[PDB]
């Protein structure tokens, strides 16, 4: 909950440090374009006062001077009028003198024209310094993603790391483009519009200064009174999506078991109560202005009335009151959007330390450059003792060895330590006091790129990025022509179902008709691995959904026929692992027994009783 505000704000501002010149060129250019839009009303008021001084002075007797005219006005009973005439500069018998008005308006138009070419450039530069410092952030995030260890990724909840690089940099965009454009000038249009408001009449400027507390108090009371409702509608639109998701995902089981009426009634009785709960949250949040504008006119009426009473008394000039009215209107605006200025900056800085916490974490092991080559394959383990958190040992001592060109296999119950053994083989996690020598040379000091690009691995869960099926299959080798892509994908038996699709090889498997099942989605990954032509192939529960015969054909065409390469085949179906070159039975690490199928079955170990659960049907 934004546990640091000063430091986070300074770090976010320091993110803007490289554009120091183009940020000074924004601050100084917005100061000069906001100190020119305030002096302009003074010039306009001087023009309208030059008008008034002649208009109410040309009917006075000519020859009569200012002081004697005021004395005559006071002698004839008009005291307020005499004070009025004494309150400005007039000369009886002279007209409007349009030359002065023209010369004043020619300056007013000049510095008003300057004030619109001096704000356009400021906005252009500001957008340049926003969209050039945010490329840096969105690229640093990407460079950090490909450097963090997997342990960072699996230890978070479902979308916590996703809604930290996508929806958590847009808020930085908003709260860095609104505090340099909409907030920086909203403070100058309170400081300068008040330093010029002061020089006109100090009495009048305190009739609006006492509406800054009166407006902040009401805009804060409304905000802290609209709490129970703005969190009772987020809580309700969450219960809405917690029902829509479960009635859309299990839609085949809502249609069947025909409770469509029940699912519609449940949605109806909690949509009519999110409507009525968002109604208040919007009414109270939209009445924030129709109330800070009531005290933006309680001050305006007082200013107008006192200004009239003061011009009529001769203490101030009409051309000054004209400018003071515009100053009141300008000073009144820097408040109608202060709630939307603070709840956007606070939100955009609370969701701005998540990015820096992500960027402040530890990188990977800083790989040593060796570019290890696999000649035959001697993946031999030596006393690997991996653990996730110190205190819970998952993989105890094991020293599995393989053959340059055999297919050593792994079986075991659920949670026995197979997928995280593959993870150890791929250096996703760090080994603990155990050597992992592949082909003699240890991979503990080996560049991760050269290792992982030479293994070749497929998993139980499939990944298909937004693209065509051809693109996903060719992702294993991007420089492969369709002649090599289709030839290496037919060996994984992808054609047999992709030709059945509406547009085979171009199905665009991110938004489909749902015509791809789990096994067909796994054959795509198998083909993608085939494209890379791996030398140390590892199928980690790859064929858990695809037919047990297609698995046999694939593992005999590209796993057993491949005499040159070796492979791990981790699977639960013993029918695909029998007669497959040194099966290993695991039970939470602690390899129970190993060897080929005959020696393993002729000893009545855990393998035999496990086959009795998988063939004898006893459990």
């Amino acid at each position: 909950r934004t546990r640091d505000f000063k430091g986070s704000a300074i770090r976010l501002a320091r993110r803007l440090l490289p554009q120091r010149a183009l940020t000074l060129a924004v601050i100084l250019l917005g100061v000069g374009g906001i100190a020119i839009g305030v002096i302009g009303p003074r010039i306009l008021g001087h023009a309208t006062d030059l008008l008034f001084n002649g208009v109410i002075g040309r009917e006075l007797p000519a020859g009569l001077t200012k002081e004697q005219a005021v004395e005559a006005a006071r002698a004839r009973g008009d005291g307020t009028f005499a004070d009025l005439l004494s309150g400005m500069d007039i000369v009886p018998g002279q007209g409007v003198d349009f030359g002065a008005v023209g010369r004043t308006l020619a300056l007013a138009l000049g510095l008003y024209l300057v004030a619109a070419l001096l704000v356009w450039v400021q906005a252009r530069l500001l957008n340049v310094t926003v969209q050039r410092t945010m490329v840096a952030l969105r690229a640093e995030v990407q460079e950090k993603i490909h450097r963090l260890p997997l342990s960072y990724f699996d230890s978070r909840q479902r979308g916590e790391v996703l809604s930290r690089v996508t929806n958590d940099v847009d808020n930085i965009q908003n709260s860095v483009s609104m505090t340099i454009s909409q907030l920086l000038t909203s403070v100058l249009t309170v400081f300068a519009v008040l330093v010029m408001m002061l020089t006109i009449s100090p009495l009048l400027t305190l009739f609006t200064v006492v509406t800054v507390p009166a407006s902040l108090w009401v805009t804060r009371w409304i905000t802290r009174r609209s709490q129970p409702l703005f969190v009772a509608q987020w809580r309700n639109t969450g219960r809405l999506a917690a029902h829509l998701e479960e009635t859309y995902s299990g839609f085949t089981i809502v249609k069947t078991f025909g409770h469509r009426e029940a699912a519609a009634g449940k949605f109806a009785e909690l949509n009519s109560e999110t409507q009525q709960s968002s109604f208040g949250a919007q009414f109270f949040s939209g009445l924030v202005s129709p109330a800070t504008m009531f005290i933006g006119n309680l001050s305006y009426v007082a200013v107008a009335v006192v200004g009239g009473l003061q011009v009529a008394t001769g203490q101030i000039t009409l051309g000054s009151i004209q400018a003071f009215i515009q100053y009141v209107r300008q000073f009144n605006q820097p408040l109608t959007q202060v709630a939307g200025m603070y709840n956007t900056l606070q939100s955009g800085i609370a969701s701005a330390e998540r990015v820096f916490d992500l960027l402040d974490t530890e990188e990977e092991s800083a790989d040593s450059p060796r570019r290890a080559d696999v000649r035959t394959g001697r993946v031999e383990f030596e006393h690997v003792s991996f653990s996730y958190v110190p205190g819970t040992p998952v993989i105890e001592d094991l020293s599995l060895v393989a053959e340059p060109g055999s297919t050593v296999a792994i079986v075991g119950p659920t949670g026995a330590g197979k997928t995280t053994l593959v993870n150890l083989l791929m250096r996703f996690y760090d080994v603990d006091s155990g050597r992992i020598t592949i082909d003699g040379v240890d991979i503990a000091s080996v560049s991760r790129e050269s290792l992982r690009a030479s293994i070749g691995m497929v998993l139980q869960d499939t990944w298909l990025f937004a693209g065509t099926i051809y693109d996903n299959i060719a992702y294993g080798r991007p420089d492969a022509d369709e002649d090599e892509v289709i030839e290496a994908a037919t060996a994984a038996y992808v054609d047999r179902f992709v030709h059945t699709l509406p547009n085979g090889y171009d199905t665009r498997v991110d938004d489909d008709g749902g015509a791809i099942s789990a096994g067909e989605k796994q054959l795509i990954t198998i083909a993608r691995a085939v494209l890379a032509r791996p030398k140390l192939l590892v199928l980690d529960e790859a064929t858990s959904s695809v037919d047990t015969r297609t698995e046999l054909l694939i593992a005999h065409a590209m796993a057993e026929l491949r005499r040159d390469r070796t492979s791990f085949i981790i699977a639960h179906r013993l029918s695909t692992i029998r007669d497959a070159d040194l099966i290993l039975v695991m039970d939470s690490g602690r390899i129970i027994e190993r060897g080929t199928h005959e020696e393993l079955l002729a000893r009545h170990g855990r393998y035999w009783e496990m086959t009795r659960v998988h063939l004898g049907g006893i459990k």
Binding site: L44, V101, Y112, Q275, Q326
Partner: protein, 574 residues
């Protein structure tokens, strides 16, 4: 964006005399905010020009009454705006959900479960927030402009030509910019969405991205999206930089000309100085209303593709519904009669099924088997009409399935699909879906039959343990057997298992099959699986391969008859 208006005038139909009370209060609240300078003009006119110091203090009451009326009808406009705009959106998702619940599997699978959720719970939110923003805060610009023109015509109409010329340009030079900005602004939203997709696909498959060492291709395919978003946004911020300076230059130049052409009038004596005070505030308030309204013209490009997607959902005509004259058989007991059934996708080369034909007797058990993707996945869905046969005919004992009411069809079919989805709640209600009025012991009967009592009786509250939203707490065969028991308590005429027994081991599969055989002595059963040991006891077995059926018979009569079934059974023995 012609769909946004069609989708917008359709659904806020009943709230016509609730937006006509907002558009008539936004007129009173802008004729009372433009009238304050009009009476300040009287202050400068009838109170300042003469002595008349009592007039100002007497007429300040008129200024206070006006500003009280201006808020009593400004807090009464946001109340009626964000109530019609909440009735709408509510009525929009209550019609999106109602239409979606009419989709079949074929269409509902084309959008998905997340792209169909973000298109009904968050997507409607954009159009619902648009209405509550262009009824209280965006219509105040045309209202203020027209009201300023009319007030300037009421007051010394001779100089109203300045406001009649200052306004068509203020809304035309601000319409040209919006016209040149909207395409670039809607081309930025579909590009900031294509970078979020790249990030999502790079975080979802971070393991396999590094598995191929394919990190040079990443953060270089991302570098062609970041630098392109920063171009399509820097180009939209190039037209947005002309919306403040142009609208302030127009107003300020009109204001400067106002004093000249008003002095040229006061010289003749046909105009008073307070009218300048009134006109300058008219211009300033028009500028304030135009700026605040055109600052948030970002909603339209963002809520114009949202309306397009919601209309895409709402325009998808369903293809599976009740027929005009559906037959009502007294009993629809299981007798499946598939002949010539074919399923083919639109534009596909090879059909999913081609000329499959098998008929099951009253109370026996059939079992289809084949390789992955060899059509057998859709055979279950065709029986319960989750799809439509293209050129075939399947019937249950008296009528073609599509010549039969679908609700009665589902009422006597106990279906266990490939994935067992368990709804949020309790076991006493999650599996209540089977019968919906089952007794206490009747819900234990299924859990015994489905070999599921061993985790449901071992709980303090018995058959009342909590479940996750999708049942994710039950890992595997636990969920599978829960779904199985859900199927068992229906007294179904047709048991329909699609890859159900794959999650269980062999012993529990055998136990469940024996329990079903002892229970479903007369109900037909159709089992789909890729295993042989769970198909041996089936009364008849059919093998389908690349679609077409290749063999029909029993286990013994087929193991030595066709090569495909023989090789399928080879990889089962140990």
């Amino acid at each position: 964006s012609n769909m946004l208006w069609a989708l917008l005038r359709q659904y806020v139909r009943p709230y016509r005399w609730l937006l006509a009370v907002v558009a008539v209060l936004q007129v009173i609240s802008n004729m009372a905010s433009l009238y304050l300078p009009t009476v300040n003009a009287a202050i400068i006119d009838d109170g300042v020009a003469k002595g008349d110091t009592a007039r100002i203090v007497e007429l300040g009451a008129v200024m206070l009454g006006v500003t009280a009326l201006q808020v009593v009808c400004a807090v009464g406009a946001v109340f009626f705006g964000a109530r019609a705009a909440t009735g709408f959106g509510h009525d929009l998702r209550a019609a999106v959900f109602t239409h979606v619940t009419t989709f079949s599997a074929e269409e509902a699978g084309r959008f998905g479960a997340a792209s169909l959720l973000t298109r009904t719970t968050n997507d409607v939110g954009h159009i619902q927030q648009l209405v509550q923003l262009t009824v209280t805060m965006l219509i105040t610009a045309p209202i203020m402009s027209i009201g300023g023109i009319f007030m300037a015509l009421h007051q010394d109409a001779g100089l109203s030509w300045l406001l009649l010329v200052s306004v068509p340009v203020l809304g035309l030079a601000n319409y040209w910019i919006i016209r040149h900005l909207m395409p670039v602004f809607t081309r930025m939203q579909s590009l900031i969405d294509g970078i979020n997709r790249v990030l999502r696909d790079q975080l979802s498959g971070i393991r396999v991205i590094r598995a191929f060492a394919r990190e040079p291709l990443e953060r270089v395919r991302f570098a062609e999206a970041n630098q392109t978003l920063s171009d399509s946004a820097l180009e939209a911020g190039r037209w947005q930089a002309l919306m403040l300076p142009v609208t302030t230059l127009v107003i300020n130049v009109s204001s400067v000309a106002l004093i000249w052409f008003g002095g040229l009038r006061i010289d003749a004596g046909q105009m008073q100085v307070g009218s300048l005070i009134a006109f300058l505030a008219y211009f300033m308030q028009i500028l304030m209303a135009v700026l605040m309204a055109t600052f948030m013209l970002v909603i339209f490009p963002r809520a114009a593709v949202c309306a397009d997607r919601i209309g895409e959902v709402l325009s998808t005509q369903t293809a599976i519904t009740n027929p005009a004259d559906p037959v009502r058989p007294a009993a629809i007991a299981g007798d499946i009669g598939v002949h010539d059934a074919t399923f083919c996708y639109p534009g596909a080369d090879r059909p999913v099924l081609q000329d499959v034909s098998f008929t099951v007797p009253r109370g026996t058990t059939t079992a289809v088997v084949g390789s992955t993707g060899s059509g057998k996945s859709t055979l279950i869905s065709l029986i319960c009409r989750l799809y439509d046969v293209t050129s075939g005919s399947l019937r249950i004992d008296g009528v073609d399935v599509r010549d039969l009411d679908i609700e009665q069809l589902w009422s006597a079919i106990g279906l266990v699909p490939q994935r067992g989805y368990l709804f949020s709640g309790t076991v006493a209600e999650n599996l209540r879906y089977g019968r919906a009025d089952a007794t206490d012991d009747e819900m234990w009967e299924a859990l015994r039959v489905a070999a599921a009592a061993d985790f449901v009786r071992a709980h303090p509250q018995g058959l009342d343990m909590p479940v996750a939203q999708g049942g994710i707490n039950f890992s595997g065969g636990q969920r599978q057997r829960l779904a199985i028991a859900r199927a068992v308590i229906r007294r179904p005429a047709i048991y329909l298992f699609d890859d159900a027994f794959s999650a269980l081991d062999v012993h529990t599969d055998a136990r469940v099959r024996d329990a079903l055989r002892e229970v479903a002595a007369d109900a037909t059963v159709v089992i789909v699986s890729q295993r042989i040991s769970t198909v041996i006891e089936a009364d008849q077995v059919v093998v389908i391969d690349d679609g077409r059926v290749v063999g029909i018979g029993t286990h013994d009569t087929l193991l030595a008859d066709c090569p495909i079934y023989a090789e399928f059974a080879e990889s089962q023995a140990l």
